[PDB]
Tab-separated table of C-alpha atoms in Angstrom:
chain	number	residue	atom	x	y	z
K	1	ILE	CA	13.625	156.373	74.173
K	2	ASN	CA	16.751	154.745	75.490
K	3	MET	CA	18.299	155.980	78.680
K	4	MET	CA	21.801	156.007	79.901
K	5	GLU	CA	23.337	155.221	83.009
K	6	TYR	CA	26.331	157.372	84.507
K	7	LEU	CA	28.352	155.548	87.230
K	8	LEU	CA	31.419	156.630	89.406
K	9	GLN	CA	32.261	154.120	92.059
K	10	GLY	CA	34.493	153.498	94.971
K	11	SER	CA	34.751	152.319	98.461
K	12	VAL	CA	35.153	153.220	101.925
K	13	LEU	CA	36.542	151.485	105.166
K	14	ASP	CA	33.807	151.014	107.821
K	15	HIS	CA	35.511	152.710	110.472
K	16	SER	CA	35.729	156.009	108.875
K	17	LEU	CA	31.918	155.602	107.146
K	18	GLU	CA	30.151	157.712	109.553
K	19	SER	CA	32.200	160.871	108.706
K	20	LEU	CA	31.324	160.060	104.725
K	21	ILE	CA	27.538	159.743	105.861
K	22	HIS	CA	27.891	163.050	107.936
K	23	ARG	CA	29.730	164.616	105.126
K	24	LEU	CA	26.731	163.440	102.629
K	25	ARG	CA	23.989	164.702	104.989
K	26	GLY	CA	25.782	168.095	104.174
K	27	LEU	CA	26.156	168.094	100.545
K	28	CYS	CA	23.263	165.858	99.690
K	29	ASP	CA	19.368	167.368	99.892
K	30	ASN	CA	17.524	168.076	103.220
K	31	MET	CA	16.740	164.592	103.963
K	32	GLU	CA	17.360	161.774	106.573
K	33	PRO	CA	18.858	158.648	105.343
K	34	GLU	CA	16.861	156.048	103.825
K	35	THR	CA	18.553	152.545	104.819
K	36	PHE	CA	17.876	150.527	102.186
K	37	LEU	CA	17.995	146.598	102.392
K	38	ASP	CA	17.469	144.647	99.119
K	39	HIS	CA	17.878	141.115	97.745
K	40	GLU	CA	19.709	141.040	94.449
K	41	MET	CA	19.971	137.970	91.941
K	42	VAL	CA	21.462	137.542	88.790
K	43	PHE	CA	19.833	135.736	85.625
K	44	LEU	CA	21.624	134.675	82.539
K	45	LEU	CA	20.080	133.502	79.179
K	46	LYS	CA	22.813	130.962	77.626
K	47	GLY	CA	21.822	131.820	73.784
K	48	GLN	CA	23.565	130.834	70.664
K	49	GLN	CA	25.705	133.930	71.037
K	50	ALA	CA	29.217	134.160	72.620
K	51	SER	CA	27.733	136.840	75.198
K	52	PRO	CA	24.895	135.340	76.930
K	53	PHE	CA	21.867	137.866	78.073
K	54	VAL	CA	22.320	139.267	81.841
K	55	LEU	CA	19.182	140.495	84.072
K	56	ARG	CA	19.082	141.790	87.287
K	57	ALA	CA	16.258	141.442	89.657
K	58	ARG	CA	15.955	143.224	93.307
K	59	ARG	CA	13.208	142.545	95.998
K	60	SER	CA	13.386	145.220	98.274
K	61	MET	CA	12.777	143.124	101.638
K	62	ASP	CA	12.843	145.986	103.995
K	63	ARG	CA	9.799	147.666	102.446
K	64	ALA	CA	6.778	145.525	102.136
K	65	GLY	CA	4.784	146.022	98.767
K	66	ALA	CA	7.745	147.588	96.869
K	67	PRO	CA	7.303	146.371	93.288
K	68	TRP	CA	10.350	144.149	92.012
K	69	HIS	CA	12.856	145.479	90.001
K	70	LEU	CA	14.322	144.404	86.517
K	71	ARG	CA	17.390	145.715	85.307
K	72	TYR	CA	19.448	145.356	82.047
K	73	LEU	CA	22.601	147.161	81.748
K	74	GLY	CA	23.959	147.358	78.414
K	75	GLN	CA	27.706	147.162	77.678
K	76	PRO	CA	29.631	149.936	78.237
K	77	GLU	CA	30.154	152.562	75.158
K	78	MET	CA	33.813	152.790	74.180
K	79	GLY	CA	33.174	156.110	72.767
K	80	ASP	CA	34.968	158.811	74.770
K	81	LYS	CA	31.674	161.224	74.521
K	82	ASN	CA	31.598	161.314	78.087
K	83	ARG	CA	35.225	160.446	79.307
K	84	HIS	CA	34.757	160.697	82.879
K	85	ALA	CA	31.701	158.161	83.760
K	86	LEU	CA	30.716	154.702	82.904
K	87	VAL	CA	28.255	155.504	80.294
K	88	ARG	CA	25.815	152.243	79.809
K	89	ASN	CA	22.435	151.679	78.144
K	90	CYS	CA	19.864	151.165	81.035
K	91	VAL	CA	16.493	149.673	80.701
K	92	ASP	CA	14.646	149.432	84.277
K	93	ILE	CA	11.169	147.838	84.727
K	94	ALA	CA	8.807	147.396	87.388
K	95	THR	CA	7.285	144.082	87.891
K	96	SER	CA	5.166	141.895	89.906
K	97	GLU	CA	6.354	139.381	92.399
K	98	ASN	CA	6.028	136.258	90.187
K	99	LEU	CA	9.233	137.622	88.213
K	100	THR	CA	11.638	134.643	89.138
K	101	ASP	CA	9.083	132.053	88.105
K	102	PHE	CA	8.216	134.059	84.882
K	103	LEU	CA	11.896	134.036	83.963
K	104	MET	CA	12.346	130.412	84.679
K	105	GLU	CA	10.158	129.921	81.894
K	106	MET	CA	11.998	132.386	79.542
K	107	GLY	CA	14.936	130.388	79.830
K	108	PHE	CA	16.921	132.072	82.658
K	109	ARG	CA	19.067	130.401	85.202
K	110	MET	CA	20.352	132.310	88.474
K	111	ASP	CA	24.070	133.017	88.821
K	112	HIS	CA	24.407	134.311	92.426
K	113	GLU	CA	22.440	136.204	95.028
K	114	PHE	CA	23.690	138.938	97.191
K	115	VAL	CA	22.120	141.147	100.050
K	116	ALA	CA	22.994	144.613	99.879
K	117	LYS	CA	22.145	147.135	102.870
K	118	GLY	CA	23.156	150.575	103.184
K	119	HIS	CA	22.036	154.184	102.609
K	120	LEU	CA	20.754	155.949	99.956
K	121	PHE	CA	20.876	159.695	99.295
K	122	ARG	CA	20.503	162.176	96.345
K	123	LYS	CA	21.256	165.457	95.264
K	124	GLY	CA	19.332	166.657	92.092
K	125	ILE	CA	19.539	163.860	89.597
K	126	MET	CA	22.479	162.321	91.269
K	127	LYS	CA	21.902	159.156	93.816
K	128	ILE	CA	24.511	158.263	95.895
K	129	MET	CA	24.406	154.931	97.331
K	130	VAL	CA	26.676	153.782	100.113
K	131	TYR	CA	26.078	149.813	100.920
K	132	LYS	CA	27.773	146.714	101.867
K	133	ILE	CA	27.207	143.605	99.753
K	134	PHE	CA	26.696	140.474	101.604
K	135	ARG	CA	27.514	137.091	100.368
K	136	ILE	CA	24.279	134.653	100.644
K	137	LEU	CA	25.325	131.019	101.188
K	138	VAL	CA	22.553	128.317	101.797
K	139	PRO	CA	21.288	129.840	98.532
K	140	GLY	CA	17.491	129.646	99.518
K	141	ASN	CA	17.611	131.574	102.868
K	142	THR	CA	18.243	135.095	103.044
K	143	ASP	CA	19.281	135.032	106.597
K	144	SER	CA	22.270	133.008	106.305
K	145	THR	CA	24.772	135.803	104.966
K	146	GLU	CA	28.419	137.091	105.487
K	147	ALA	CA	29.746	140.268	104.818
K	148	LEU	CA	32.202	139.906	101.560
K	149	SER	CA	34.891	142.643	102.907
K	150	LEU	CA	35.393	145.148	105.477
K	151	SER	CA	34.760	148.048	102.922
K	152	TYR	CA	31.489	149.461	101.883
K	153	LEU	CA	30.917	149.974	98.244
K	154	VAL	CA	30.006	153.716	97.302
K	155	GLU	CA	28.268	154.570	93.981
K	156	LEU	CA	27.508	157.815	92.510
K	157	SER	CA	24.794	157.154	89.688
K	158	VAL	CA	22.797	159.342	87.170
K	159	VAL	CA	19.996	157.733	84.900
K	160	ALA	CA	19.149	159.967	82.090
K	161	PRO	CA	18.538	160.557	78.499
K	162	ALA	CA	20.986	158.977	75.541
K	163	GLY	CA	23.732	161.866	74.573
K	164	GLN	CA	22.941	164.484	76.964
K	165	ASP	CA	26.237	165.945	78.191
K	166	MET	CA	27.226	168.154	80.842
K	167	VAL	CA	26.105	165.443	83.283
K	168	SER	CA	29.522	163.788	83.944
K	169	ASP	CA	31.208	167.271	84.720
K	170	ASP	CA	28.730	167.641	87.771
K	171	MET	CA	29.531	163.974	88.654
K	172	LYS	CA	33.154	165.043	88.596
K	173	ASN	CA	32.773	168.050	90.778
K	174	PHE	CA	30.555	166.127	93.369
K	175	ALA	CA	33.104	163.681	93.228
K	176	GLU	CA	35.683	166.031	93.919
K	177	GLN	CA	33.921	167.269	96.657
K	178	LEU	CA	34.317	164.197	98.590
K	179	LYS	CA	38.066	163.449	97.397
K	180	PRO	CA	39.719	163.165	101.045
K	181	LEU	CA	36.921	160.721	102.057
K	182	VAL	CA	36.402	158.606	99.020
K	183	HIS	CA	38.191	158.399	95.688
K	184	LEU	CA	35.478	158.045	93.003
K	185	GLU	CA	36.356	157.000	89.461
K	186	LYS	CA	35.396	155.600	85.869
K	187	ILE	CA	36.511	151.967	86.804
K	188	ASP	CA	36.201	149.736	83.669
K	189	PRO	CA	34.408	146.388	84.281
K	190	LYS	CA	37.010	144.430	82.663
K	191	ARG	CA	39.388	142.608	85.189
D	1	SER	CA	40.277	177.296	98.694
D	2	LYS	CA	39.606	175.561	101.934
D	3	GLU	CA	42.925	173.543	101.471
D	4	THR	CA	44.681	176.853	101.164
D	5	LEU	CA	43.126	178.414	104.074
D	6	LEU	CA	43.992	175.463	106.383
D	7	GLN	CA	47.692	175.884	104.861
D	8	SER	CA	47.677	179.270	105.862
D	9	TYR	CA	46.332	178.563	109.304
D	10	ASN	CA	49.569	176.055	109.537
D	11	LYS	CA	51.822	178.565	108.420
D	12	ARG	CA	50.682	181.278	110.953
D	13	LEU	CA	50.931	178.664	113.518
D	14	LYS	CA	54.285	177.268	112.860
D	15	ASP	CA	55.631	181.106	112.528
D	16	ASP	CA	54.205	182.091	115.776
D	17	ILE	CA	55.619	179.009	117.769
D	18	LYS	CA	58.898	179.733	116.017
D	19	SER	CA	59.050	183.456	116.847
D	20	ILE	CA	58.331	182.734	120.548
D	21	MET	CA	60.806	180.425	120.806
D	22	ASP	CA	63.459	182.656	118.892
D	23	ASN	CA	62.802	185.588	120.969
D	24	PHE	CA	63.148	183.854	124.044
D	25	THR	CA	66.219	182.038	123.328
D	26	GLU	CA	68.005	185.462	122.066
D	27	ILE	CA	66.585	187.142	125.048
D	28	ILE	CA	68.263	184.576	127.338
D	29	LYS	CA	71.735	184.757	125.355
D	30	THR	CA	72.177	188.472	125.623
D	31	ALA	CA	71.633	187.982	128.939
D	32	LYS	CA	74.918	186.467	128.871
D	33	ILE	CA	77.639	188.699	130.374
D	34	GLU	CA	80.799	188.796	128.187
D	35	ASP	CA	84.015	190.802	128.538
D	36	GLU	CA	83.808	194.176	126.598
D	37	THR	CA	86.354	194.830	123.421
D	38	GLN	CA	85.504	198.065	121.545
D	39	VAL	CA	82.011	198.181	122.292
D	40	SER	CA	81.960	200.967	125.213
D	41	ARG	CA	80.133	199.694	128.095
D	42	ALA	CA	77.381	202.731	128.040
D	43	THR	CA	76.493	201.842	124.551
D	44	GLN	CA	76.547	198.261	124.895
D	45	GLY	CA	74.412	198.506	127.518
D	46	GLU	CA	71.760	200.765	126.091
D	47	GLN	CA	71.584	198.509	122.640
D	48	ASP	CA	70.985	195.539	125.103
D	49	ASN	CA	68.270	197.133	126.877
D	50	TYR	CA	66.600	198.154	123.520
D	51	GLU	CA	66.793	194.354	122.286
D	52	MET	CA	65.474	192.890	125.469
D	53	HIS	CA	62.724	195.139	125.477
D	54	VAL	CA	61.606	194.859	121.481
D	55	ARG	CA	61.997	190.937	122.141
D	56	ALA	CA	59.749	190.948	124.815
D	57	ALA	CA	57.257	193.378	122.608
D	58	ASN	CA	57.584	190.721	119.850
D	59	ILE	CA	56.810	187.787	121.875
D	60	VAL	CA	53.708	189.564	123.293
D	61	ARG	CA	52.794	190.326	119.595
D	62	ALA	CA	53.067	186.520	118.822
D	63	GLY	CA	51.001	185.694	121.822
D	64	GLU	CA	48.318	188.225	120.464
D	65	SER	CA	48.767	186.568	116.876
D	66	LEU	CA	48.079	183.076	118.576
D	67	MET	CA	45.102	184.355	120.189
D	68	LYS	CA	43.704	185.470	116.463
D	69	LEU	CA	44.730	182.119	115.030
D	70	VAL	CA	42.653	180.273	117.689
D	71	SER	CA	39.778	182.583	117.106
D	72	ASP	CA	40.034	182.090	113.130
D	73	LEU	CA	39.898	178.277	114.059
D	74	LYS	CA	36.864	178.577	116.179
D	75	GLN	CA	34.987	180.487	113.391
D	76	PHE	CA	36.025	177.681	110.648
D	77	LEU	CA	34.726	175.203	113.354
D	78	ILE	CA	31.332	176.858	113.845
D	79	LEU	CA	30.771	177.462	110.427
D	80	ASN	CA	31.615	174.436	108.694
D	81	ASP	CA	32.491	171.372	110.811
D	82	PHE	CA	29.714	169.304	109.234
D	83	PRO	CA	29.347	166.673	111.886
D	84	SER	CA	28.533	169.235	114.765
D	85	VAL	CA	25.721	171.300	112.131
D	86	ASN	CA	23.902	167.696	111.596
D	87	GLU	CA	23.665	167.005	115.487
D	88	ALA	CA	22.255	170.484	115.978
D	89	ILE	CA	19.997	170.394	113.152
D	90	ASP	CA	18.646	166.965	114.543
D	91	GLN	CA	18.553	168.280	118.407
D	92	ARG	CA	16.309	171.124	117.223
D	93	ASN	CA	14.019	169.245	114.910
D	94	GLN	CA	13.458	166.565	117.882
D	95	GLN	CA	12.975	169.132	120.136
D	96	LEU	CA	10.324	171.377	117.868
D	97	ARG	CA	8.362	167.912	116.997
D	98	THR	CA	8.058	167.190	120.978
D	99	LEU	CA	6.545	170.569	121.242
D	100	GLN	CA	4.289	170.327	118.285
D	101	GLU	CA	2.980	166.979	119.828
D	102	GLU	CA	2.195	168.503	123.094
D	103	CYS	CA	0.383	171.436	121.713
D	104	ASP	CA	-1.687	169.249	119.452
D	105	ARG	CA	-2.449	166.979	122.502
D	106	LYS	CA	-3.737	169.803	124.451
D	107	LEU	CA	-5.916	170.867	121.711
D	108	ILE	CA	-7.565	167.401	120.812
D	109	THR	CA	-8.490	167.231	124.570
D	110	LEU	CA	-9.858	170.598	124.621
D	111	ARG	CA	-11.945	170.085	121.625
D	112	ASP	CA	-13.469	166.680	123.102
D	113	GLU	CA	-14.307	168.271	126.646
D	114	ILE	CA	-15.774	171.052	124.589
D	115	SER	CA	-17.801	168.993	122.421
D	116	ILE	CA	-19.481	167.168	125.454
D	117	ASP	CA	-20.015	170.754	126.944
D	118	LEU	CA	-21.902	171.820	123.605
D	119	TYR	CA	-23.949	168.584	123.542
D	120	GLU	CA	-25.299	169.357	127.075
D	121	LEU	CA	-26.068	172.814	126.061
D	122	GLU	CA	-27.659	172.012	122.704
D	123	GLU	CA	-29.887	169.635	124.311
D	124	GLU	CA	-30.894	172.399	127.040
D	125	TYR	CA	-31.550	175.058	124.378
D	126	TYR	CA	-33.200	173.470	121.897
D	127	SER	CA	-35.592	171.871	124.532
D	128	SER	CA	-36.449	175.127	126.209
D	129	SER	CA	-39.968	176.060	126.155
D	130	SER	CA	-39.974	179.704	126.108
E	1	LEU	CA	30.171	170.733	120.223
E	2	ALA	CA	31.422	171.917	123.460
E	3	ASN	CA	34.487	169.484	123.112
E	4	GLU	CA	36.408	171.179	120.370
E	5	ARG	CA	35.399	174.388	121.398
E	6	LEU	CA	36.372	173.862	124.993
E	7	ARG	CA	39.680	172.884	123.699
E	8	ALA	CA	39.888	175.990	121.837
E	9	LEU	CA	39.240	177.777	125.456
E	10	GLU	CA	41.862	175.727	127.066
E	11	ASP	CA	44.542	176.569	124.210
E	12	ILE	CA	43.749	180.397	124.809
E	13	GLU	CA	44.316	180.024	128.629
E	14	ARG	CA	47.610	178.347	127.763
E	15	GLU	CA	48.577	180.920	125.758
E	16	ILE	CA	48.256	183.153	128.646
E	17	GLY	CA	50.293	180.399	130.570
E	18	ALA	CA	53.028	180.524	128.183
E	19	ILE	CA	53.467	184.512	128.378
E	20	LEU	CA	53.156	184.404	132.311
E	21	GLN	CA	55.829	181.402	132.234
E	22	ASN	CA	58.461	183.723	130.184
E	23	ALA	CA	57.735	186.431	132.313
E	24	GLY	CA	58.167	184.564	135.351
E	25	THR	CA	61.438	182.963	134.361
E	26	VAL	CA	62.846	186.309	133.447
E	27	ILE	CA	61.487	187.835	136.690
E	28	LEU	CA	63.560	184.875	138.563
E	29	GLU	CA	66.603	185.609	136.289
E	30	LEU	CA	66.532	189.298	137.281
E	31	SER	CA	66.954	188.751	140.890
E	32	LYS	CA	69.873	190.053	142.593
E	33	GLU	CA	69.977	186.440	144.188
E	34	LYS	CA	67.888	183.936	142.595
E	35	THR	CA	68.372	180.917	145.153
E	36	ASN	CA	65.773	178.711	144.031
E	37	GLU	CA	67.368	177.704	140.474
E	38	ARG	CA	65.764	174.289	140.867
E	39	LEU	CA	62.545	176.584	140.717
E	40	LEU	CA	63.705	178.119	137.644
E	41	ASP	CA	64.540	174.995	135.884
E	42	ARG	CA	60.848	174.166	136.877
E	43	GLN	CA	59.874	177.327	135.271
E	44	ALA	CA	61.656	176.849	132.179
E	45	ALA	CA	60.307	173.491	131.765
E	46	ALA	CA	56.814	174.585	132.676
E	47	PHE	CA	57.440	177.327	129.705
E	48	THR	CA	58.723	174.788	127.075
E	49	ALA	CA	55.838	172.405	127.957
E	50	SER	CA	53.277	175.014	127.482
E	51	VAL	CA	54.585	175.916	124.102
E	52	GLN	CA	55.164	172.415	123.064
E	53	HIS	CA	51.524	171.318	123.846
E	54	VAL	CA	49.945	174.635	122.698
E	55	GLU	CA	51.672	173.628	119.315
E	56	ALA	CA	50.518	169.806	119.667
E	57	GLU	CA	46.909	170.850	120.310
E	58	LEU	CA	46.617	173.533	117.319
E	59	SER	CA	48.469	171.146	115.013
E	60	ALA	CA	46.094	168.412	115.715
E	61	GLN	CA	42.944	170.832	115.411
E	62	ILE	CA	44.107	171.912	111.981
E	63	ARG	CA	44.684	168.325	111.092
E	64	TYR	CA	41.250	167.502	112.010
E	65	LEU	CA	39.646	170.555	110.333
E	66	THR	CA	41.547	169.466	107.337
E	67	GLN	CA	39.937	166.173	107.428
E	68	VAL	CA	36.213	167.430	107.628
E	69	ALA	CA	36.473	170.500	105.553
E	70	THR	CA	34.585	170.595	102.129
E	71	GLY	CA	34.124	174.359	100.724
E	72	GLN	CA	30.746	173.851	100.336
E	73	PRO	CA	27.923	175.675	102.144
E	74	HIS	CA	25.881	172.841	103.912
E	75	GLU	CA	22.569	172.508	102.316
E	76	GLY	CA	20.741	171.227	105.499
E	77	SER	CA	18.330	173.056	107.757
E	78	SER	CA	15.766	173.091	110.363
E	79	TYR	CA	13.136	175.706	108.872
E	80	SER	CA	10.053	173.312	108.407
E	81	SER	CA	10.059	171.963	111.934
E	82	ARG	CA	10.049	175.704	113.491
E	83	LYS	CA	7.198	176.530	110.862
E	84	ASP	CA	5.325	173.829	112.183
E	85	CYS	CA	6.078	174.637	115.843
E	86	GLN	CA	5.220	178.132	115.274
E	87	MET	CA	1.578	177.218	113.594
E	88	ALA	CA	0.914	174.950	116.483
E	89	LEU	CA	1.552	177.663	119.331
E	90	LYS	CA	-0.568	180.130	117.297
E	91	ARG	CA	-3.513	177.635	116.972
E	92	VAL	CA	-3.559	177.241	120.967
E	93	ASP	CA	-3.288	180.953	120.964
E	94	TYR	CA	-6.283	181.215	119.074
E	95	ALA	CA	-8.056	178.887	121.262
E	96	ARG	CA	-7.069	180.795	124.304
E	97	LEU	CA	-8.649	184.027	122.776
E	98	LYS	CA	-11.865	182.410	121.948
E	99	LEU	CA	-12.379	180.617	125.313
E	100	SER	CA	-11.852	184.033	126.833
E	101	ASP	CA	-14.706	185.095	124.716
E	102	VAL	CA	-16.944	182.404	125.579
E	103	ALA	CA	-16.084	182.821	129.274
E	104	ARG	CA	-16.773	186.252	129.287
E	105	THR	CA	-20.549	185.640	127.722
E	106	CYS	CA	-20.869	183.289	130.377
E	107	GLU	CA	-19.864	185.805	133.137
E	108	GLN	CA	-22.668	188.241	131.266
E	109	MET	CA	-25.282	185.627	131.540
E	110	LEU	CA	-24.602	184.378	135.021
E	111	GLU	CA	-24.337	188.135	136.097
E	112	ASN	CA	-27.644	188.934	136.092
């Protein structure tokens, strides 16, 4: 069926970051952190419509043999069903490594690349990712990069089935367990 | 809540410091000698003695309450200061992993030496004439 | 771990010092002659410095505890590593008992 993604987002200045990580190692599951390092690139298809189609492709540079990942994110639902999280339609697809070449045949062109380097935790269904967004200049190269800002970004995400309430309330409680350190909230993608 | 408990600790600390300072200042103020008028020296002196003793007792009580506050703060730190729990868990994990690895290296070397001895004994026993 | 706890231990000792400085100051004031009035001023400054830095340390630690409190019971643990270490030690003990038995049968064979 059609699965929905619930998002809460925020940010954290880096000099307080470690305390956040220590807080997360208390609250999230009994695991060591994951330290993911990913290359993300955004393709778009300039169809007839006013809205061009958008697709996100991620190659996990750090882990060899990890399948590439496609993600289609639907536009956010204006209905006030879950009032507190970004509720979107998510289609996530594991793929082989010729993907970009295949997408070049489908009519897609690139928009921007960015590295993302950070940590990954989980709590039940929830996925906490705390990462820094790295701008790539010299667009072919993945080493020539610069940090976008001083702050790290924090995302609390749950991918789950369409509708399916009592999900955003648990995300509210897990966000409120961090509220001195981070302010996580449903931020609209407009402006 | 945690916020409520921390506020309560702040209130207790402020109250204890205020009480010690007030009692000491009041003892010092009574220590002033003043000229008497309608107070009957003897009564004034006993009342002053009682006041000083009671204030000293109050100062000692405030010190005991400060000791209680320190103990409660120590308990809170030992129970839910997340960083130190993480360093304790990690140090415990690394120490136990090193002990496990030492035990397994000892066992593997034991197995190899015992296997060589078993080979010699098998040759001797099976090739025995009897 | 020893850092903040040793701070709490120091504040215990300084609460004792505050009470003793109160007592020493009124000790000097009760004297028939108290010549060392400069030392009375020194003990008074010692008393007030003790009370002030006790307040400073405890206020700082309540602030730091406000920064790292969560009200949640810390779901981390170290149980699995202790379990594996116990199994490794019992493997070693089993091998020790078996080696004792083999050595005992060897002594019985060589004994005759």
